Amino acid sequence: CYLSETANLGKLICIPMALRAAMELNVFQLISKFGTDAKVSASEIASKMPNAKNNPEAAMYLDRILRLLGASSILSVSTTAASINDVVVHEKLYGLTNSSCCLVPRQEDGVSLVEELLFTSDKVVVDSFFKLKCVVEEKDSVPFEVAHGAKIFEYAATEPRMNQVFNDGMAVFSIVVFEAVFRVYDGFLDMKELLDVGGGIGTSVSKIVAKYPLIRGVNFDLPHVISVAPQYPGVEHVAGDMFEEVPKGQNMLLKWVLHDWGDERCVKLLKNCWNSLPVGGKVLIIEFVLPNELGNNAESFNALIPDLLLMALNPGGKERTISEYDDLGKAAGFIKTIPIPISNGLHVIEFHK
Amino acid sequence: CYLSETANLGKLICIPMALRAAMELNVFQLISKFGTDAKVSASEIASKMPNAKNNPEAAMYLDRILRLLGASSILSVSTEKLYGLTNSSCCLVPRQEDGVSLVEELLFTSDKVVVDSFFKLKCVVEEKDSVPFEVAHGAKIFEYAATEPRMNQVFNDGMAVFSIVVFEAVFRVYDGFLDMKELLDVGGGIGTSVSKIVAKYPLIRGVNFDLPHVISVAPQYPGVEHVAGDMFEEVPKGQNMLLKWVLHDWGDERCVKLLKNCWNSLPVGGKVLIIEFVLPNELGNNAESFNALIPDLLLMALNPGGKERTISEYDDLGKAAGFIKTIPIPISNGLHVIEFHK
Numbered sequence: 001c002y003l004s005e006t007a008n009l010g011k012l013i014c015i016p017m018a019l020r021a022a023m024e025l026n027v028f029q030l031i032s033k034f035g036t037d038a039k040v041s042a043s044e045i046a047s048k049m050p051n052a053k054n055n056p057e058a059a060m061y062l063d064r065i066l067r068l069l070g071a072s073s074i075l076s077v078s079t080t081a082a083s084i085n086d087v088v089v090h091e092k093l094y095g096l097t098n099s100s101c102c103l104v105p106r107q108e109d110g111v112s113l114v115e116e117l118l119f120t121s122d123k124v125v126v127d128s129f130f131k132l133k134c135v136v137e138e139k140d141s142v143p144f145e146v147a148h149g150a151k152i153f154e155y156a157a158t159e160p161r162m163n164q165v166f167n168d169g170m171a172v173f174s175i176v177v178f179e180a181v182f183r184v185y186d187g188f189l190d191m192k193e194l195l196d197v198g199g200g201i202g203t204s205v206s207k208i209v210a211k212y213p214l215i216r217g218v219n220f221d222l223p224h225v226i227s228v229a230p231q232y233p234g235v236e237h238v239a240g241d242m243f244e245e246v247p248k249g250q251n252m253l254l255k256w257v258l259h260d261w262g263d264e265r266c267v268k269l270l271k272n273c274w275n276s277l278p279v280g281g282k283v284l285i286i287e288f289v290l291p292n293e294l295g296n297n298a299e300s301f302n303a304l305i306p307d308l309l310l311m312a313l314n315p316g317g318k319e320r321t322i323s324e325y326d327d328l329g330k331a332a333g334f335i336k337t338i339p340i341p342i343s344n345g346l347h348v349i350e351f352h353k
Numbered sequence: 354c355y356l357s358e359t360a361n362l363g364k365l366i367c368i369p370m371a372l373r374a375a376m377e378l379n380v381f382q383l384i385s386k387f388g389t390d391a392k393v394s395a396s397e398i399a400s401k402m403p404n405a406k407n408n409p410e411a412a413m414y415l416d417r418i419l420r421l422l423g424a425s426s427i428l429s430v431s432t433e434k435l436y437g438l439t440n441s442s443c444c445l446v447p448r449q450e451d452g453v454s455l456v457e458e459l460l461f462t463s464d465k466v467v468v469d470s471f472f473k474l475k476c477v478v479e480e481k482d483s484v485p486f487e488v489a490h491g492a493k494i495f496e497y498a499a500t501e502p503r504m505n506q507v508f509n510d511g512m513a514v515f516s517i518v519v520f521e522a523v524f525r526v527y528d529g530f531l532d533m534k535e536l537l538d539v540g541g542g543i544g545t546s547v548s549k550i551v552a553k554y555p556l557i558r559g560v561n562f563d564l565p566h567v568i569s570v571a572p573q574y575p576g577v578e579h580v581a582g583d584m585f586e587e588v589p590k591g592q593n594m595l596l597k598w599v600l601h602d603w604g605d606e607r608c609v610k611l612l613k614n615c616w617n618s619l620p621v622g623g624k625v626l627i628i629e630f631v632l633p634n635e636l637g638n639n640a641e642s643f644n645a646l647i648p649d650l651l652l653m654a655l656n657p658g659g660k661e662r663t664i665s666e667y668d669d670l671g672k673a674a675g676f677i678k679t680i681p682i683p684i685s686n687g688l689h690v691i692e693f694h695k
């Protein structure tokens with residue numbers, strides 16, 4: 001069946017690259033602006049692209065991208081009786097699906113999955129993936145380091161474009177995740193202070209303080225992140241190195257931090273958190289938890305995606321099961337681990353001092 | 354619904370890159386050497402990788418690649434988990450008889466030179482006359498190949514090995530090579546196509562015609578003469594011609610110029626055979642559709658004017674160049690032989 005499998009295997013590189021181009025051309029948002037149940041042609045979409053206005057062929061090229069996304073069910077495809085009724089209509093109409101509506105920046109605040117997906121398909125990430133085999137062949141190799149000559153957070157301090165793509169990918173994705181957290185988890189209600197350890201540009205703690213305005217928010221990250229962090233209401237920024245010293249705080253958050261590192265580094269960081277917490281404080285771990293048994297579901301893929309990314313991007317980074325997270329907390333001196341399922345594998349895991 | 358769709362969308366970049374790594378590590382052949390029906394662990398596969406033998410962590414890293422392919426119907430998974438081949442991954446095992454598989458073409462289509470071109474894909478929409486490959490590399494693809502031996506090899510070998518499985522499908526359906534005495538393969542690459550035709554039809558004198566930078570690296574094949582030149586300037590005289598995966602590289606005006614060069618170099622009664630994946634009149638989630646959409650997207654990125662065409666559009670090109678008679682012959686999953694008669 002070689003000439004069946006050419007289609008099944010050959011489409012795999014094509015689909016994400018077509019998707020990235022469509023995101024960069026703001027196709028999904030343009031479709032959305034035609035309204036509910038809109039179905040629009042490539043030429044209608046191209047008409048809304050100022051950069052295409054002196055390119056007669058723009059629509060025909062755009063249609064070649066969109067028809068692949070239609071065949072792969074990212075866009076819906078249809079026509080009309082007027083179109084059907086010696087003339088050949090090349091142009092089908094495209095509409096959003098449940099997947100592509102997650103690519104439309106929200107009217108209120110511009111949030112979507114666009115920024116995280118533009119990070120995970122960025123050239124810096126794909127270049128790392130081109131070196132993925134090195135992790136199997138070579139003891140202690142990291143694909144990102146083979147590709148770029150430096151580790152990712154070191155590299156970010158030298159490369160402002162990559163810094164921005166990464167920081168924004170994490171920040172906007174964090175908004176979506178905290179909306180889900182706030183619907184299920186009530187553990188912030190009693191807090192008076194929250195320190196976000198490796199908090200990025202501060203978006204996560206900015207949203208926590210907005211929802212819970214008695215919380216004094218502190219954001220802690222590396223110098224090159226804090227330098228570009230916005231001023232957020234109710235947030236104080238702190239620059240440093242979490243492996244050397246964590247600021248004192250009543251409660252701490254580690255979101256998407258532990259999965260970046262191996263066990264010894266995770267225990268070192270957790271012990272630094274323990275030392276900086278009071279008796280009765282807690283640290284919250286927010287991660288996509290690896291299910292105990294993998295299957296064909298969102299929970300499994302939500303862990304496998306960052307598992308493969310972190311294998312390429314940082315030494316020791318991996319996704320972990322509940323048991324493996326409990327073992328890290330216990331080794332660092334925490335007690336009473338409380339795993340709280342949120343959505344499709346995302347958990348809050350509380351570690352108590 | 355965001356945290357449902359994160360899985361569906363975020364896996365799209367991960368699966369092809371995991372697949373590439375598995376092919377570069379020869380995972381599928383290593384599983385196959387335990388037996389085609391075998392189900393084997395990451396540690397058992399890693400044990401067959403001499404490069405991994407001083408890496409205690411190799412199998413755990415390998416498992417993390419394989420479990421994603423197992424979640425994506427490229428490998429079977431059963432209870433370290435055990436991995437087996439599927440219908441798709443059997444096509445990634447170099448055949449025991451001759452080493453043929455889809456690996457070489459899939460390594461070309463996910464090569465850095467191609468992915469770097471796809472990073473510039475939006476330029477084709479915004480900017481009149483831009484070509485993503487040229488924006489990314491500073492030269493057109495066939496000029497780049499002349500100065501970049503690694504890319505030339507990856508491209509030529511991708512085309513050549515793919516051509517073997519294509520001709521195996523052609524020979525099951527199409528008998529039009531019988532009674533030819535000479536065949537010129539115009540843009541024939543390294544000559545593998547015409548070598549397979551001469552192997553099947555031993556009275557054909559085969560000639561392989563391509564650019565100097567391709568001909569100078571082509572192997573010697575029994576019954577094949579290599580000729581270097583520029584098909585847009587002139588094609589050698591030949592009794593019959595083949596254009597496989599050539600017309601889809603170029604826009605209409607360039608195709609008509611090439612086809613007129615072929616007409617001029619054919620005798621009365623000669624034919625030129627076009628071999629292409631033909632764009633079907635309705636697209637869907639099926640092999641015939643994707644077999645055309647994949648190269649359509651690639652050529653949009655890789656060469657000015659390149660695109661996939663329908664039967665009607667191929668007929669229009671042949672008629673503009675002076676041919677008569679167009680005979681479209683379906684072979685498999687969208688692949689056609691289209692005869693143009695002088």
Ligand SMILES: Nc1ncnc2c1ncn2[C@@H]1O[C@H](CSCC[C@H](N)C(=O)O)[C@@H](O)[C@H]1O
Pocket residue numbers: 153170171174197198199200201204220221222225240241242243254255256257260
């Ligand atoms: N040694 C260190 N000290 C402090 N922050 C660090 C660090 N090494 C990495 N980081 C930070 O760890 C963060 C991981 S990305 C996650 C950011 C944020 N918590 C979120 O969930 O969106 C980055 O912002 C990175 O700069």
Ligand SMILES: Nc1ncnc2c1ncn2[C@@H]1O[C@H](CSCC[C@H](N)C(=O)O)[C@@H](O)[C@H]1O
Pocket residue numbers: 495512513516539540541542543546562563564567582583584585596597598599602
């Ligand atoms: N001006 C030109 N003259 C001759 N060959 C050319 C050419 N421009 C491109 N080509 C050749 O066109 C071929 C396209 S790739 C297809 C190769 C082969 N027919 C196959 O089906 O496998 C390449 O080998 C390329 O070098």
Ligand SMILES: COc1cc2c(cc1O)[C@@H]1Cc3ccc(OC)c(OC)c3CN1CC2
Pocket residue numbers: 116117120152170256257260288301302303305306309310313314359360363
């Ligand atoms: C389900 O789909 C996805 C899930 C996740 C991510 C991306 C996805 O597309 C990101 C990826 C990522 C990469 C690198 C990191 O640190 C270096 C990262 O850590 C900061 C991350 C963070 N993760 C979060 C989980």
Ligand SMILES: COc1cc2c(cc1O)[C@@H]1Cc3ccc(OC)c(OC)c3CN1CC2
Pocket residue numbers: 006007010458459462494512598599602630643644645647648651652655656
């Ligand atoms: C169904 O999957 C595939 C189909 C095809 C191909 C690759 C696939 O993965 C190649 C791609 C390709 C690229 C560039 C070319 O010339 C510049 C090419 O022409 C020389 C080609 C040739 N095509 C052939 C069809």
